[PDB]
Design a binder for this molecule. Structure first.
Ligand SMILES: [Zn+2]
Lengths: 122, 24, 80, 60, 155, 98, 206, 127
RNA sequence: GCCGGGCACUCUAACGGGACUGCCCGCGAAAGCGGGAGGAAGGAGGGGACGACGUCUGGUCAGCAUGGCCCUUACGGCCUGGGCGACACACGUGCUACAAUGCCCACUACAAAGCGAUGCCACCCGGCAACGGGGAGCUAAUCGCAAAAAGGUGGGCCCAGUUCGGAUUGGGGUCUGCAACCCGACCCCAUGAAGCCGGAAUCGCUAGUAAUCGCGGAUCAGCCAUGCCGCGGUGAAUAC
């Protein structure tokens, strides 16, 4: 099922499958079958060619997805980046942005640990 | 599933209510 | 994802102080500590100087940076 | 507790968010109990003397 | 334990079969004190034995245990500034304890998905003298007479 | 139907005071339901012993606010004579609502 | 440090509260603050009177402050002049119109609070620490007392290394929750420092 | 006519009622098995009856308040025991040897301060 | 249990009883030990509170107080803004998880102890929702916070980095509050990281303990609480 931007989720349940798309989560999915009538309990493989299209044409003409989201965000980041925006700076430095601490647990934004030397006391 | 603020036990933990744990 | 419900906040200190700058046209430099305030479209183009911990960094305002606050333009922490 | 902050914190402020608690006795402010109005040190010092009625020693 | 031998906890027999050996086994499966679950595991795990084996699971259980109790073990000892492995005859208390414990530690290692099953199967391959619950047995004894070079110290 | 509540800190001070109301009430009143405990509400206080910093110290303090009740049905002006101004305890509070 | 203020440990079997009344939630905090205010005058003006305790019975609008003195012929004053003052100087604070009873102290030597003080003043008068203590103890022993004890903080006679002077007679079972040992505490202020006097007096049994 | 007994366990009380009948248990108007559904040791309740071959001679009108379902069990159990003496006191003869007229303070132990539970002390690393 | 009616039971809480190796057997010179019995409970029945003489020149002059020296147009006082949250790193206490003895959704059942006046908020309604509008009850054993959770039944998942895990980031809202940029929590959509059970080493815990599960309070507008102090639910192993 070549749904959404170049993607093919398959052999799995419908409601799960969609999750696989950049724009679709465990919310939009169930709300994209409620709007169709397709019973999520069925597998992608057991879809009526028709059933399939309905999905496609919906999904694409409404929610931004991969081909277009990864863009809006990318540039959205640059938005404040271009301006002397605090939040921006945090983006340049590769630190937390939403307001965390930089003395400990922040390894998710920095990644591997960069161990430096210290000094004696004994 | 105690940190997934979008699950049953998720709210139970934080003690909040939302679209996943309603008031009945 | 931050928010101030229904009623955007700006300090009357410079609000009514900035509007008195439109009657004449434009100005050059403004200085007011209130960084608490959100930026209004009616301020665009002005050159406001906001206070750091000790300094007074001037901030030029643009169309694309209206959705933000003054403080977002005043770095307080000196680093590297 | 500097006189400058005890007598100070008593005056009605321009914003009610600003009004903090202090111990009526010690002047401490790190941790006073509403129910009595004293610092965790002062609570003790008095409870012992028996100067706070109905205030016994817990045991279970 | 320093002053006395410390009395051993007497358990309540099973509601179904009535053998306390049962109670002991479940206790060992029970995690986070969910004894209501641990019980089901054993039960449905017995049902698997009736459908796959033409015998009474009670007896099956016993023969399994009986067959894993190792009768020889090692006990570390610093004899002359060195770690000498000292084989020794194992007591009835410890045997029982070791068996159940291995029946479960091995069980949960099976490639099977469902837990009731995993246990059921360990109780079968056990009796037949195989699996891994019995392997952790022969592996121990294989250390017993392995360094029986040292059986000349304490006991 | 005189509802009498008795809240106090010392159970001896209440017990007695509740007895004082119970005695001269059958003398000039009618059928009394007697004194009844509630509940009793406590106010725990977990403070640290040393003024310095030893979290592991902590002294425990409590404050029990006992509650008593004495009902009097079929209220006569006679009853309200004995129980008008014949009290004695000092650390006891009473409130009547009829 | 170890120990546990003897009194605070006994308000349960025997030893009542220094202020017994009742209160809500909205009034308790306030009431008490006013209470402590009271002693903040009694202690100051009734120093030389030989103050001991300050019972306080509250009630509706009415209030009663019983003050235990060693020397009432002082609080009273000439025919009733000082006690008159102390009431007005009192209502000046509390707008409650409160009485002030006065109960003479049957033997100041058996009253721990007082005892402690006795030493205190003696230390300010530059007296002899060691001796001051011993005598103190005997004073309690001779009259009645089943046990006495006096302690001192430090800088006995103004030394450069504060020490502790231990001294007692009879029994003083700070562990027997059926003792009824009064405990006083003084606080002498000397040229070289502050020193802390402590009494302990054993009385009776069950 | 009516045989009460009283059964308390781990902060939970159980009103025990043994009327002579076919042999059924009604707890809070509910079918016994419908209440204790999934409870492995549930069957434990009836142990004291099956003790004196007295299975099915009495009925069971039982209430309960407080505690926990997996403690409500032992709770009833004791109760049933206490009423049974009423009918025939000579019953202890087989009851006590089984120890069904016993009550242990297995209660949840006070949480001490400084700690993290009753005993569970907090861990130290470099000492 | 709604009404009468009734205090019996559950309870609530104030007083009192009850175990003392008292009884039986054995060991013992005695003290006491072992075993048994009757008993709700045994040999200190479980837990508290309770810390000797002193030790460390322990800690604390930033709680308070206080000798001494030091500042007094400032080493003082008001304020605004910033900072205490900084980050190449490192260690401690912990929280969440790596999953099928499990995760999810649904229906369903047992708890205790606490707190509540402008405060707890039933209930109706608007909204996915946080929340908001409306509005009853409670001065609190008689109202509310409240749903306990694990459990139990049904059904979904099928061993995947996954319906495991929820970090980070985008976006859009709610509320508190003068004000949430620095630096608040909460909701919702999307994003879905590390992580597949831990090197050397190291902690806790001897029974209703541990393990696990939820609940409450102090402080507090709100909250960075995964902390602290209590509450109960379920409920081990093991000690030569
Ligand atoms: Zn204070």
């Amino acid at each position: 099922a070549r749904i959404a931007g170049v993607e093919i989720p398959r052999n799995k349940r419908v409601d799960v499958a969609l999750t696989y798309i950049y724009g679709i989560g465990k919310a939009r999915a169930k709300e994209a079958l409620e709007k169709t009538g397709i019973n999520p309990a069925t597998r992608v493989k057991d879809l009526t060619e028709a059933e399939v299209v309905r999905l496609r044409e919906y999904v694409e003409n409404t929610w931004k997805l991969e081909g277009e989201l990864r863009a809006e965000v990318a540039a959205n980041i640059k938005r404040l980046m271009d301006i002397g925006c605090y939040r921006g700076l945090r983006h340049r430095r590769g630190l937390p942005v939403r307001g965390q601490r930089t003395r400990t647990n922040a390894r998710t934004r920095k990644g591997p640990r960069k161990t430096v030397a210290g000094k004696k006391k004994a | 599933g105690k940190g997934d603020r979008r699950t049953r036990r998720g709210k139970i933990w934080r003690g909040t209510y939302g679209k996943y744990r309603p008031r009945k | 994802p931050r928010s101030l419900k229904k009623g955007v906040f700006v300090d009357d200190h410079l609000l009514e102080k900035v509007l008195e700058l439109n009657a004449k046209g434009e100005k050059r430099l403004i200085k007011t500590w209130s960084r608490r305030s959100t930026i209004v479209p009616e301020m665009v183009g002005h050159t406001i100087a906001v206070y750091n911990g000790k300094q007074h960094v001037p901030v030029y305002i643009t169309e694309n940076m209206v959705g933000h606050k003054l403080g977002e333009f005043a770095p307080t922490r000196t680093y590297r | 507790a500097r006189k400058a902050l005890i007598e100070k914190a008593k005056r009605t402020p321009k914003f009610k968010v600003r009004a903090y608690t202090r111990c009526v006795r010690c002047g401490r402010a790190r941790s006073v109990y509403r129910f009595f109005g004293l610092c965790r040190i002062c609570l003790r010092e008095l409870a012992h003397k028996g100067q706070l009625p109905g205030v016994r020693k817990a045991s279970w | 334990a320093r002053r006395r031998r410390a009395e051993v906890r007497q358990l309540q027999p099973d509601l179904v079969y009535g053998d306390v050996l049962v109670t002991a086994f479940i206790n060992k499966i029970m995690r986070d004190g969910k004894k209501n679950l641990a019980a089901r595991i054993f039960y449905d795990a017995c049902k698997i034995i009736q459908e796959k084996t033409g015998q009474e699971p009670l007896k099956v259980f016993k023969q399994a245990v009986e067959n894993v109790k190792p009768r020889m073990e090692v006990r570390s000892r610093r004899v002359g500034g060195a770690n000498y492995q000292v084989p020794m005859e194992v007591s009835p208390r410890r045997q029982q304890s070791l068996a159940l414990r291995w029946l479960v530690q091995a069980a949960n290692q099976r490639p099977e998905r469902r837990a009731a099953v995993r246990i059921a199967h360990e109780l079968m391959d056990a009796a037949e003298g195989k699996g891994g619950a019995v392997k952790k047995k022969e592996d121990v004894e294989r250390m017993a007479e392995a360094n029986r070079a040292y059986a000349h110290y304490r006991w | 139907k005189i509802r009498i509540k008795l809240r106090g800190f010392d159970h001896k001070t209440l017990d007695a005071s509740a007895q004082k109301i119970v005695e001269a009430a059958r003398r000039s009143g009618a059928q009394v339901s007697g004194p009844i405990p509630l509940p009793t509400r406590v106010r725990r206080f977990t403070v640290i012993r040393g003024p310095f910093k030893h979290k592991d110290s902590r002294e425990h303090f409590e404050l029990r606010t006992h509650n008593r009740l004495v009902d009097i049905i079929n209220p006569n002006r006679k009853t309200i004579e004995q129980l008008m101004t014949l009290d004695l305890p000092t650390g006891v509070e009473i409130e009547i609502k009829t | 440090g170890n120990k546990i203020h003897p009194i605070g440990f006994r308000l349960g079997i025997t030893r009542d509260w220094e202020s017994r009344w009742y209160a809500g939630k909205k009034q308790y905090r306030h009431l008490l603050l006013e209470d402590q205010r009271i002693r903040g005058l009694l202690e100051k003006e009734l120093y030389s009177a030989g103050l001991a305790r300050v019972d306080i019975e509250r009630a509706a609008d009415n209030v009663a402050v019983t003050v235990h003195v060693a020397k009432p012929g002082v609080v009273i004053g000439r025919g009733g002049e000082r006690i008159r003052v102390l009431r007005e100087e009192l209502a000046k604070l509390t707008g409650k119109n409160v009485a002030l009873n006065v109960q003479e102290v049957q033997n100041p030597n058996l009253s721990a609070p007082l005892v402690a003080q006795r030493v205190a003043e003696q230390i300010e008068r530059r007296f002899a620490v060691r001796r001051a203590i011993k005598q103190a103890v005997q004073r309690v022993m001779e009259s009645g007392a089943k046990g006495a004890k006096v302690i001192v903080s430090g800088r006995i006679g103004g030394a450069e290394q504060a020490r502790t002077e231990w001294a007692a007679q009879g029994r003083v079972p700070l562990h027997t929750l059926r003792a009824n040992i009064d405990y006083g505490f003084a606080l002498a202020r000397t040229t070289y420092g502050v020193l802390g006097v402590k009494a302990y007096i054993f009385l009776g049994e069950v | 006519e009516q045989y009460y007994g009283t059964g308390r366990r781990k902060e939970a009380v159980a009103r025990v009622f043994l009327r002579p009948g076919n042999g059924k248990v009604t707890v809070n108007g509910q079918d016994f098995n419908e209440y204790f559904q999934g409870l492995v040791r549930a069957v434990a309740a009836l142990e004291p009856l099956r003790a004196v071959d007295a299975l099915g001679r009495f009925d069971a009108y039982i209430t309960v308040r407080g505690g926990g379902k997996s403690g409500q069990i032992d709770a009833i159990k004791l109760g049933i025991a206490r009423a049974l003496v009423q009918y025939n006191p000579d019953y202890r003869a087989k009851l006590k040897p089984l120890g069904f007229l016993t009550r242990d303070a297995r209660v949840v132990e006070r949480k001490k301060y400084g700690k993290h539970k009753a005993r569970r002390a907090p861990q130290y690393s470099k000492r």
